[PDB]
Amino acid sequence: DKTVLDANLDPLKGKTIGVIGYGNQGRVQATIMRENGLNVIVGNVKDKYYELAKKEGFEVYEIDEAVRRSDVALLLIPDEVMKEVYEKKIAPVLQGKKEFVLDFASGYNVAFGLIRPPKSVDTIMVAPRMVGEGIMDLHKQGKGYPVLLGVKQDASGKAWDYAKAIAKGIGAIPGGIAVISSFEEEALLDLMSEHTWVPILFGAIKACYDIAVKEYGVSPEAALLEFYASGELAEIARLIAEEGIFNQMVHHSTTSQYGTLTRMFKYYDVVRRIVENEAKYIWDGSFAKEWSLEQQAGYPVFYRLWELATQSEMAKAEKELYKLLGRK
Amino acid sequence: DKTVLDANLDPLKGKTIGVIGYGNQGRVQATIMRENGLNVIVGNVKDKYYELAKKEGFEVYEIDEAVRRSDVALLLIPDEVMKEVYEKKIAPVLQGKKEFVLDFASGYNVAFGLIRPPKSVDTIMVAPRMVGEGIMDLHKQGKGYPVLLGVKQDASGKAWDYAKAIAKGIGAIPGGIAVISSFEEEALLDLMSEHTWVPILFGAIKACYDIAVKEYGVSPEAALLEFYASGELAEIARLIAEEGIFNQMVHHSTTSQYGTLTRMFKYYDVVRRIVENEAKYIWDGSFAKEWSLEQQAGYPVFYRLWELATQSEMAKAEKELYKLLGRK
Amino acid sequence: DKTVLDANLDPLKGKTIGVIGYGNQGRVQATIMRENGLNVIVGNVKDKYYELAKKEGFEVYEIDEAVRRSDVALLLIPDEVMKEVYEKKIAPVLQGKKEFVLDFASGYNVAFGLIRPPKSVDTIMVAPRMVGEGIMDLHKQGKGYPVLLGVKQDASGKAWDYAKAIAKGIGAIPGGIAVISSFEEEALLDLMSEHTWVPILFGAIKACYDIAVKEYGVSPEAALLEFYASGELAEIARLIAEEGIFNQMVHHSTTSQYGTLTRMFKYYDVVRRIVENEAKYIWDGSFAKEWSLEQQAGYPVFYRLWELATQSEMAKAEKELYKLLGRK
Amino acid sequence: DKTVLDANLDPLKGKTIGVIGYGNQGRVQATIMRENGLNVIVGNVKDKYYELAKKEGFEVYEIDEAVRRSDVALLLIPDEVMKEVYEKKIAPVLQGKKEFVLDFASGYNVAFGLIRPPKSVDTIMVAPRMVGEGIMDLHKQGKGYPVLLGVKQDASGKAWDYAKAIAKGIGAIPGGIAVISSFEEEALLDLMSEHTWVPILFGAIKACYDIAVKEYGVSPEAALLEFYASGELAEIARLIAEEGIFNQMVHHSTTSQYGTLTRMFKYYDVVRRIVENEAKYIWDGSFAKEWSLEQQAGYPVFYRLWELATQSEMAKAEKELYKLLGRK
Ligand SMILES: NC(=O)C1=CN([C@@H]2O[C@H](COP(=O)(O)OP(=O)(O)OC[C@H]3O[C@@H](n4cnc5c(N)ncnc54)[C@H](O)[C@@H]3O)[C@@H](O)[C@H]2O)C=CC1
Ligand SMILES: NC(=O)C1=CN([C@@H]2O[C@H](COP(=O)(O)OP(=O)(O)OC[C@H]3O[C@@H](n4cnc5c(N)ncnc54)[C@H](O)[C@@H]3O)[C@@H](O)[C@H]2O)C=CC1
Ligand SMILES: NC(=O)C1=CN([C@@H]2O[C@H](COP(=O)(O)OP(=O)(O)OC[C@H]3O[C@@H](n4cnc5c(N)ncnc54)[C@H](O)[C@@H]3O)[C@@H](O)[C@H]2O)C=CC1
Ligand SMILES: O=C(O)C1(C(=O)O)CC1
Ligand SMILES: O=C(O)C1(C(=O)O)CC1
Ligand SMILES: O=C(O)C1(C(=O)O)CC1
Ligand SMILES: O=C(O)C1(C(=O)O)CC1
Ligand SMILES: [Mg+2]
Ligand SMILES: [Mg+2]
Ligand SMILES: [Mg+2]
Ligand SMILES: [Mg+2]
């Protein structure tokens, strides 16, 4: 199938590589690659992270100076401002090149056209799904992790083998796997989650609390303990990742199984409608517009919501409680 | 009636004129006027068009330098960015004047207040309805073409005679006609079309294709031939422009006449509702806001839609076919 | 694929052919075929067209006399009355034959069962999509045109090779193409257009006019100029036929592109519903019934609608105007 | 105003006139005109009416023979079959003429295009509103009556003076009046009544009966007496025609006035909607189609409804009663 379990490491040996950033990924992938036998460099904003980067023994010039030396570049930096940075400090230099290759972590800014490099650069993606620390929590085990790969532009007939070259350049396969996928799919996915089941879950919890308290005379403490103040959810998620989502439930009681299944098959249509709406909203590019404007206005809504959430009853009760249990 | 079939040419003889741009209109109208016995100049961004302009024998200074010399100016340039250009490079100079006159092709930026020149300048419009090449395709015939005229500000009691002076300064009347109309009407009209019957037409065609294929076992080729791959529509539009929209249908079969008329009178209310909605959306200024913001965000939606349209089935089939017929 | 770019001319050489009519197609296809090296004849109502036909040097007997001599027949005549004519003057003669072949331009009368020849005749279709004059406008260029082919009944195991034989007998391939398709598809298509996007377009235009005038108090002249009195639509249709429907819009302004695309994707569902309704109405045979009855009653509705359309405001204004521009 | 109170009698003196029919109008208008000093003739189906016509001293040839002799013709015959009769026995003869004039009582068959005489005949209407006997009930009083006039085609520049000539040729003005009006208006009106307030009235009466009987234990006799078996309605209608519709109610009780007015203003919208629907149904020509087909099928619905109405309870009770009162 489309999967790839291992590949070559040929095109990247003999060239220099441009690593932009020393954050979570940047540091991890960069240390990995240096340890994989390649000549690499770093570009970074000269701050605490730069201290740490030069600390770990990576020569770090300015951004553009790392792009002039390298024939490849990895932009391991945020999604919200990368645009301007590319416009000012990277586009000129890049125009000062002929054969180049650029790879990202996320496809947001590219899939939606906020960044359109020239046709003189093969354009690709390599994206994992962790938060980042798990990857050292796997590398010290000699394992490998799974990732997504994409190609946006090929001016060399070699974008894909460069893709797998990079892949093995970061220690994913062999040991994990590597999926090939457009930029579009990656963004669509990373957003659907952030828009569909996470917020639904949180709202459902909040509603259960509010109801139980204001309509059946219950104590906040008990509600919090039942719903999320206990690590129940964590164990469930672990068992899911290990055994399977459904096979997991065998370790539960029959009553739980019955209720869960019935209600699941009973509410599947509603959430389906919701998911359709949101995925459509995304495929078109509307959310990108919304978010970019919200940046351009001063993050007001962001602010007010961050306020309301914390000033809710549930949060205050959680505060009193976590204090009681010593949890910070 | 409000029409005007010919007028004078007095106020423009003895003055200099400022022509901003050498594109489609700029070149045509400018060559026309030079050939109409006037002293004119050109302002242009120094690029290929500037090469062509100085090629055809028009002294072309910088924009502001053409405004300092001229007592009139014609801004024959786009609608999406003209704002900034006026703010930086034209407003100062114009402030360095007392009696001036400015005329545009479109009323978008003025009707909605994105450009507010001083009360020391008579403000007007002169707009034709072609794409531009038809106008030489008429001038070499010695004909004249129809246009729209408007006045936004009059500080001379002469805005209108300047209007008709310009009109005859471009070779429209005598030979065509000249309508007088606010900036607002022009914009309203140029937008209603672009929002109402064009997109409806395209969507209807697309839907006919999709249906015929996916629900009655038809070949893409036949559908494309029937609907638009044939030049039927072109001949129909020509006959419309020549004889009249309805009188045109006499050259059709009775069956076609019957079905067309019945269905037309059957669906008139729906589209009427739609048109009402859109015209209202415009009269208020909302669309201008939408579009300006979409510029300020990075044209994401534009991008995604341009993608989806081309990646549709109909387009791919059209590709294979046009290839077969040799059509580029 | 199903297409055919060229084929043989064997079965038609050595036989006589029956051409019924000398109208648009009849004359064109007949002259073409005579010029393609075949023995042909004509049948016609003895009137002006008969004068013109015998003028151009085609021996023209009575209809039935041309069917007795020919082993093939092409019924190149209307769709509304052909029934009776076949019942009286053609069915008897045809019954006086054993091996025969009949081909039409349109599949209306056959697809719906208004004409059911015997099982002793291979039944087929050959239909182009022009209005007819374009085909000489292509033949004098030595080109070829596209057409649709169908087979309703085969009593010879040769209906298809007869089909392609005829095809090349009229000068379509090589130079154009030839699609194979049931009678049903042809009728369905020729009707969907006449019921879906043509009338919608006209109604939308009419509504735009009415609104702009009676709501914003604009001048009729300007509205007419913007919407259809200008040949804008013609150039657009030409560019469509040449480049492609979407690629066409590159020659427009970004504003137009944006509005058009958004609104297109915004109204696709409505027109889809409409098209579904009408196509269903057709597939069943209801429209044929409606139309046949309307013939049998005296064309009242036809009359009243032809009246209302012309007595509308838009038409009167168009009259005054076209008069002004010299357009007949 | 548009009214006409008297006019000339010039164009009809010196010519012959063609009177088709000797029914209600035919006899009345014909006798009137003969008595008005003109040379006239009659055409009639040779039956009892022909006996009566030749009885009263009118030479009566065959239809076509009366059209060959006359330069004018009046078609004073029904609306349901006149079509065929004109097609067979009148159109040929008429084609055997150059300057002719044709006038009707009703505009049904013309307004809807079921009859389209040549452009060599001025086409007009003259229609009264009685049932016909009232007109002698006025002529023996030396009065005059009101009528409607229309012109469909004028090939003489004299259609209107011929109109008024005819008008005075039948004894309407002076003494009554004469309104000018298209064929369309006449048909629209004569139908609206027959579709809107007559049937509504009858249905309301029927419903009142049914309700009163089946839901409040009332005797049929009393209901019939109250609603219509009494001549109340007749006196009311007379007073309406004499004094005015509203001024009429002064002769009623205050209670009646109050209830009537309140309920009238309370139900005006509903019936308005209904009337709109029906008038629209007519303006388009649909009803003509419906009726013509119902003729072509065998008058089934007509039959079944004529049955149901008479086999209703109300009718049987009316039978028993009218028998009791001696009313036939
Ligand atoms: N746990 C996470 O946050 C993960 C992030 N990603 C994606 O990877 C990229 C970010 O990953 P990380 O950098 O490791 O996490 P991070 O959010 O801590 O990024 C910090 C890095 O961004 C650079 N940076 C920040 N502001 C800058 C500025 N104004 N100018 C120049 N450089 C600036 C800094 O060099 C810094 O090292 C994004 O594309 C993100 O969508 C994907 C998987 C998980
Ligand atoms: N076919 C069409 O596009 C027609 C356009 N109009 C209107 O006329 C005006 C445009 O007419 P055209 O110039 O002939 O079409 P265009 O799209 O070819 O405009 C090109 C001209 O714009 C100037 N220009 C472009 N970018 C510039 C920049 N950054 N800075 C300075 N100058 C720049 C250039 O001098 C160039 O000559 C607009 O108001 C438009 O709405 C009206 C009728 C038809
Ligand atoms: N140009 C068009 O309108 C198109 C029409 N078609 C189809 O082709 C056929 C008609 O094409 P054309 O004849 O070229 O156009 P047409 O509509 O001008 O047909 C005129 C021909 O019909 C014959 N005709 C008319 N009335 C007759 C009668 N009472 N009795 C005997 N013959 C009579 C005449 O011989 C005359 O030559 C139809 O099936 C039509 O649906 C297909 C493509 C384009
Ligand atoms: O909510 C609980 O604690 C569970 C139960 O079955 O009682 C395990 C699911
Ligand atoms: O769609 C067609 O080709 C037309 C027909 O009447 O068949 C001309 C309209
Ligand atoms: O962009 C514009 O202004 C167009 C017009 O309506 O004239 C070409 C589409
Ligand atoms: O129905 C009646 O008899 C009337 C009354 O007022 O009682 C005259 C109207
Ligand atoms: Mg994310
Ligand atoms: Mg994620
Ligand atoms: Mg526009
Ligand atoms: Mg326009």
Ligand SMILES: [Mg+2]
């Ligand atoms: Mg057709």
Ligand SMILES: [Mg+2]
């Ligand atoms: Mg067609």
Ligand SMILES: [Mg+2]
């Ligand atoms: Mg009547």
Ligand SMILES: [Mg+2]
């Ligand atoms: Mg009446």
